[PDB]
Amino acid sequence: EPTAEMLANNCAGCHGTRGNSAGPASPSIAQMDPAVFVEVMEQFKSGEIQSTIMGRIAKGYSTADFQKMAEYFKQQTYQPVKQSFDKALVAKGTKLHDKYCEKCHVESGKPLADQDEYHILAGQWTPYLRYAIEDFRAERRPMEKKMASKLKELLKAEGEDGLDALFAFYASQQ
């Protein structure tokens, strides 16, 4: 049976060596929480999460292969990406994250030793985070109701400009 590295080293062409992606859009997956990782792979595979290509890829693997790969990626060190951001919007975005998202995305979802099942926002590629929130808003992938209501409350209060601010804040954490 293939080893974790024999399985995961094929992902580097789209996600970068060790899961640190050079962008501009394919996500970094280094240091993801292993339960998060396995669940997202299973949902791409079943089609619960609609995708451009990950359903086609994840369908090629078993549960056991996802759990091996989750171990590999969890052992890597996530590197916040070097990307541009709108520095003028950073303090606004800090306040928005603090008001709407920090409750669950603790320290912006960084892979902290004492958080389980974090979802990394800080230092992730901004186009990927824009596509993910497009997918939540379209219901192309599921979200807990408690994230849905905060996202809806941020948009009702701040508009699209509120999102630009959140993204500049997450990108500034590099």
Partner: peptide, 11 residues
């Protein structure tokens, strides 16, 4: 197209 550029940089 954005993912294609990202594949190029990563591979």
């Amino acid at each position: 197209v954005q993912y294609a550029h990202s594949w190029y940089n990563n591979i």
